[PDB]
Short mmCIF file of N, CA and C in Angstrom, two decimals:
data_model
loop_
_atom_site.label_atom_id
_atom_site.label_comp_id
_atom_site.label_asym_id
_atom_site.label_seq_id
_atom_site.Cartn_x
_atom_site.Cartn_y
_atom_site.Cartn_z
N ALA A 1 12.44 93.62 42.65
CA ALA A 1 11.90 95.01 42.72
C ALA A 1 11.17 95.22 44.04
N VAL A 2 11.34 96.40 44.63
CA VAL A 2 10.55 96.83 45.77
C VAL A 2 9.72 98.04 45.31
N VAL A 3 8.40 97.89 45.29
CA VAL A 3 7.51 98.92 44.75
C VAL A 3 6.50 99.31 45.83
N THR A 4 6.47 100.59 46.18
CA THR A 4 5.69 101.09 47.31
C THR A 4 4.88 102.32 46.89
N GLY A 5 3.56 102.24 46.99
CA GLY A 5 2.67 103.35 46.64
C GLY A 5 1.74 103.77 47.78
N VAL A 6 1.74 105.07 48.10
CA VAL A 6 0.89 105.61 49.16
C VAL A 6 0.09 106.79 48.64
N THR A 7 -1.23 106.71 48.77
CA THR A 7 -2.13 107.78 48.37
C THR A 7 -3.02 108.14 49.57
N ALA A 8 -2.99 109.41 49.98
CA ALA A 8 -3.64 109.80 51.24
C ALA A 8 -4.33 111.16 51.17
N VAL A 9 -5.48 111.25 51.82
CA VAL A 9 -6.10 112.53 52.13
C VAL A 9 -6.41 112.56 53.63
N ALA B 1 -14.62 113.52 48.67
CA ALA B 1 -13.26 113.21 48.15
C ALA B 1 -13.30 111.98 47.25
N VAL B 2 -12.55 112.02 46.16
CA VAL B 2 -12.32 110.84 45.33
C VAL B 2 -10.82 110.52 45.42
N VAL B 3 -10.49 109.36 45.98
CA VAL B 3 -9.10 108.99 46.24
C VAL B 3 -8.81 107.65 45.56
N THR B 4 -7.81 107.64 44.68
CA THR B 4 -7.53 106.50 43.82
C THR B 4 -6.03 106.18 43.86
N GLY B 5 -5.68 104.97 44.30
CA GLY B 5 -4.29 104.52 44.37
C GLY B 5 -4.02 103.23 43.59
N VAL B 6 -3.01 103.26 42.72
CA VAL B 6 -2.64 102.09 41.92
C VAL B 6 -1.15 101.82 42.07
N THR B 7 -0.82 100.60 42.48
CA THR B 7 0.56 100.16 42.62
C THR B 7 0.74 98.87 41.80
N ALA B 8 1.68 98.87 40.86
CA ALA B 8 1.79 97.77 39.90
C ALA B 8 3.23 97.40 39.56
N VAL B 9 3.46 96.10 39.41
CA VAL B 9 4.68 95.60 38.77
C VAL B 9 4.26 94.62 37.68
N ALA C 1 -17.37 109.90 50.18
CA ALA C 1 -16.01 109.59 49.66
C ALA C 1 -16.06 108.35 48.76
N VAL C 2 -15.30 108.39 47.67
CA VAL C 2 -15.07 107.22 46.84
C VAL C 2 -13.58 106.90 46.93
N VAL C 3 -13.25 105.74 47.49
CA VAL C 3 -11.86 105.37 47.76
C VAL C 3 -11.57 104.03 47.07
N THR C 4 -10.57 104.02 46.19
CA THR C 4 -10.28 102.87 45.34
C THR C 4 -8.78 102.55 45.37
N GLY C 5 -8.44 101.34 45.81
CA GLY C 5 -7.04 100.89 45.88
C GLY C 5 -6.78 99.61 45.10
N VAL C 6 -5.77 99.63 44.24
CA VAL C 6 -5.39 98.46 43.43
C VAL C 6 -3.90 98.19 43.58
N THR C 7 -3.58 96.97 43.99
CA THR C 7 -2.19 96.54 44.13
C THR C 7 -2.01 95.24 43.32
N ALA C 8 -1.07 95.25 42.37
CA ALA C 8 -0.96 94.15 41.41
C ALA C 8 0.47 93.77 41.07
N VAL C 9 0.71 92.48 40.92
CA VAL C 9 1.92 91.97 40.29
C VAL C 9 1.50 90.99 39.19
N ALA D 1 9.69 90.00 44.16
CA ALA D 1 9.14 91.38 44.23
C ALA D 1 8.41 91.60 45.56
N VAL D 2 8.59 92.78 46.14
CA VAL D 2 7.79 93.21 47.28
C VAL D 2 6.97 94.42 46.82
N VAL D 3 5.65 94.26 46.80
CA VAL D 3 4.76 95.29 46.26
C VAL D 3 3.74 95.68 47.34
N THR D 4 3.71 96.96 47.69
CA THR D 4 2.93 97.46 48.82
C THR D 4 2.13 98.70 48.40
N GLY D 5 0.80 98.61 48.50
CA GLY D 5 -0.09 99.73 48.16
C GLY D 5 -1.01 100.15 49.29
N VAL D 6 -1.02 101.44 49.61
CA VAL D 6 -1.87 101.98 50.68
C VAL D 6 -2.67 103.17 50.15
N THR D 7 -3.99 103.08 50.28
CA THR D 7 -4.89 104.15 49.88
C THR D 7 -5.77 104.51 51.08
N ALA D 8 -5.75 105.78 51.49
CA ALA D 8 -6.39 106.18 52.75
C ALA D 8 -7.08 107.53 52.68
N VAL D 9 -8.23 107.62 53.33
CA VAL D 9 -8.86 108.91 53.64
C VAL D 9 -9.17 108.93 55.14
N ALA E 1 -20.13 106.27 51.69
CA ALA E 1 -18.77 105.96 51.17
C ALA E 1 -18.81 104.73 50.27
N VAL E 2 -18.06 104.76 49.18
CA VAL E 2 -17.83 103.59 48.35
C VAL E 2 -16.33 103.27 48.44
N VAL E 3 -16.01 102.11 49.01
CA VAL E 3 -14.62 101.74 49.27
C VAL E 3 -14.32 100.40 48.58
N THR E 4 -13.33 100.39 47.70
CA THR E 4 -13.04 99.25 46.85
C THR E 4 -11.54 98.92 46.88
N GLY E 5 -11.20 97.71 47.32
CA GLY E 5 -9.80 97.26 47.39
C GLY E 5 -9.53 95.98 46.62
N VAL E 6 -8.52 96.01 45.75
CA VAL E 6 -8.15 94.84 44.94
C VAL E 6 -6.66 94.56 45.09
N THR E 7 -6.33 93.35 45.51
CA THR E 7 -4.95 92.91 45.64
C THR E 7 -4.77 91.62 44.83
N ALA E 8 -3.83 91.62 43.89
CA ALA E 8 -3.72 90.52 42.93
C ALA E 8 -2.28 90.15 42.58
N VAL E 9 -2.05 88.85 42.43
CA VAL E 9 -0.83 88.34 41.80
C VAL E 9 -1.25 87.37 40.70
N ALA F 1 6.93 86.37 45.67
CA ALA F 1 6.39 87.75 45.75
C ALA F 1 5.66 87.97 47.07
N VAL F 2 5.83 89.15 47.65
CA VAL F 2 5.03 89.58 48.79
C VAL F 2 4.21 90.79 48.33
N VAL F 3 2.89 90.64 48.31
CA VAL F 3 2.00 91.67 47.78
C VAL F 3 0.99 92.05 48.86
N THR F 4 0.96 93.34 49.21
CA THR F 4 0.18 93.84 50.33
C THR F 4 -0.63 95.07 49.92
N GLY F 5 -1.95 94.99 50.02
CA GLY F 5 -2.85 96.10 49.67
C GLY F 5 -3.77 96.52 50.81
N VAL F 6 -3.77 97.81 51.12
CA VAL F 6 -4.63 98.36 52.19
C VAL F 6 -5.42 99.54 51.66
N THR F 7 -6.74 99.45 51.79
CA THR F 7 -7.64 100.53 51.39
C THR F 7 -8.53 100.89 52.59
N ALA F 8 -8.51 102.15 53.01
CA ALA F 8 -9.15 102.55 54.26
C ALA F 8 -9.84 103.90 54.19
N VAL F 9 -10.99 104.00 54.84
CA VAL F 9 -11.61 105.28 55.15
C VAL F 9 -11.92 105.30 56.65
N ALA G 1 -22.88 102.64 53.20
CA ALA G 1 -21.52 102.33 52.68
C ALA G 1 -21.57 101.10 51.79
N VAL G 2 -20.81 101.14 50.69
CA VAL G 2 -20.58 99.97 49.86
C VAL G 2 -19.09 99.64 49.95
N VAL G 3 -18.76 98.48 50.52
CA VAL G 3 -17.37 98.11 50.78
C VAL G 3 -17.08 96.78 50.10
N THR G 4 -16.08 96.77 49.22
CA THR G 4 -15.79 95.62 48.36
C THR G 4 -14.30 95.30 48.39
N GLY G 5 -13.95 94.09 48.83
CA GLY G 5 -12.56 93.64 48.91
C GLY G 5 -12.29 92.35 48.13
N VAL G 6 -11.28 92.38 47.26
CA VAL G 6 -10.91 91.21 46.46
C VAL G 6 -9.42 90.94 46.61
N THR G 7 -9.09 89.72 47.02
CA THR G 7 -7.70 89.28 47.15
C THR G 7 -7.52 87.99 46.34
N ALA G 8 -6.58 87.99 45.40
CA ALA G 8 -6.48 86.89 44.44
C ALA G 8 -5.04 86.52 44.10
N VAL G 9 -4.81 85.23 43.95
CA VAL G 9 -3.59 84.72 43.31
C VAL G 9 -4.01 83.74 42.21
N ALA H 1 4.18 82.75 47.18
CA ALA H 1 3.63 84.13 47.26
C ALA H 1 2.90 84.34 48.58
N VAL H 2 3.07 85.52 49.17
CA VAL H 2 2.28 85.95 50.31
C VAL H 2 1.46 87.16 49.84
N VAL H 3 0.14 87.01 49.82
CA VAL H 3 -0.76 88.04 49.29
C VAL H 3 -1.77 88.43 50.37
N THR H 4 -1.80 89.71 50.72
CA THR H 4 -2.58 90.21 51.84
C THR H 4 -3.38 91.44 51.43
N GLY H 5 -4.71 91.36 51.53
CA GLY H 5 -5.60 92.47 51.18
C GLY H 5 -6.52 92.90 52.32
N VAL H 6 -6.53 94.19 52.64
CA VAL H 6 -7.38 94.73 53.70
C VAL H 6 -8.18 95.91 53.17
N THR H 7 -9.50 95.83 53.30
CA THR H 7 -10.40 96.90 52.90
C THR H 7 -11.29 97.26 54.10
N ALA H 8 -11.26 98.53 54.52
CA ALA H 8 -11.91 98.92 55.77
C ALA H 8 -12.59 100.28 55.70
N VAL H 9 -13.75 100.37 56.36
CA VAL H 9 -14.37 101.65 56.67
C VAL H 9 -14.68 101.68 58.16
N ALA I 1 -25.64 99.02 54.72
CA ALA I 1 -24.28 98.71 54.20
C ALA I 1 -24.32 97.47 53.30
N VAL I 2 -23.57 97.51 52.20
CA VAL I 2 -23.34 96.34 51.37
C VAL I 2 -21.84 96.02 51.47
N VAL I 3 -21.52 94.86 52.03
CA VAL I 3 -20.13 94.49 52.29
C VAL I 3 -19.84 93.15 51.61
N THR I 4 -18.84 93.14 50.73
CA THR I 4 -18.55 91.99 49.87
C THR I 4 -17.05 91.67 49.91
N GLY I 5 -16.71 90.46 50.35
CA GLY I 5 -15.31 90.01 50.42
C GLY I 5 -15.05 88.73 49.64
N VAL I 6 -14.04 88.75 48.77
CA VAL I 6 -13.66 87.58 47.97
C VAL I 6 -12.17 87.31 48.12
N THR I 7 -11.84 86.09 48.53
CA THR I 7 -10.46 85.66 48.67
C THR I 7 -10.28 84.37 47.85
N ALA I 8 -9.34 84.37 46.91
CA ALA I 8 -9.23 83.27 45.95
C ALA I 8 -7.80 82.90 45.61
N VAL I 9 -7.56 81.60 45.46
CA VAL I 9 -6.34 81.09 44.82
C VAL I 9 -6.76 80.11 43.72
N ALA J 1 1.42 79.12 48.70
CA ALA J 1 0.88 80.50 48.77
C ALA J 1 0.15 80.72 50.09
N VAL J 2 0.32 81.90 50.68
CA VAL J 2 -0.48 82.33 51.82
C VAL J 2 -1.30 83.54 51.36
N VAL J 3 -2.62 83.38 51.34
CA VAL J 3 -3.51 84.41 50.80
C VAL J 3 -4.52 84.80 51.88
N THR J 4 -4.55 86.09 52.23
CA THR J 4 -5.34 86.58 53.36
C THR J 4 -6.14 87.82 52.94
N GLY J 5 -7.47 87.74 53.04
CA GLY J 5 -8.36 88.85 52.69
C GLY J 5 -9.28 89.27 53.83
N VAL J 6 -9.29 90.56 54.15
CA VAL J 6 -10.14 91.10 55.21
C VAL J 6 -10.94 92.29 54.68
N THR J 7 -12.25 92.20 54.82
CA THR J 7 -13.15 93.28 54.41
C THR J 7 -14.04 93.64 55.62
N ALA J 8 -14.02 94.90 56.03
CA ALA J 8 -14.66 95.30 57.28
C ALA J 8 -15.35 96.65 57.22
N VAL J 9 -16.50 96.74 57.87
CA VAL J 9 -17.13 98.03 58.18
C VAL J 9 -17.43 98.05 59.68
#
């Protein structure tokens, strides 16, 4: 699995 | 700002 | 700012 | 598994 | 600022 | 596993 | 600032 | 496993 | 500033 | 295992 999470302000 | 990031496998 | 990052396997 | 988490302000 | 980072396997 | 976590302000 | 980093296997 | 955690202000 | 870093295997 | 933790202000 390739799992990528980005959270930005 | 409240910024919350969760990345899980 | 409250900034919280969690990365888990 | 490749797991990548980014949390930014 | 309160900045909290957790990286776990 | 390759696990990478970045938390930034 | 309160800055907290945890990296674990 | 390669586990990398970065927490920055 | 309160700065706390934990790296564990 | 290669485990790398960086906490910075």
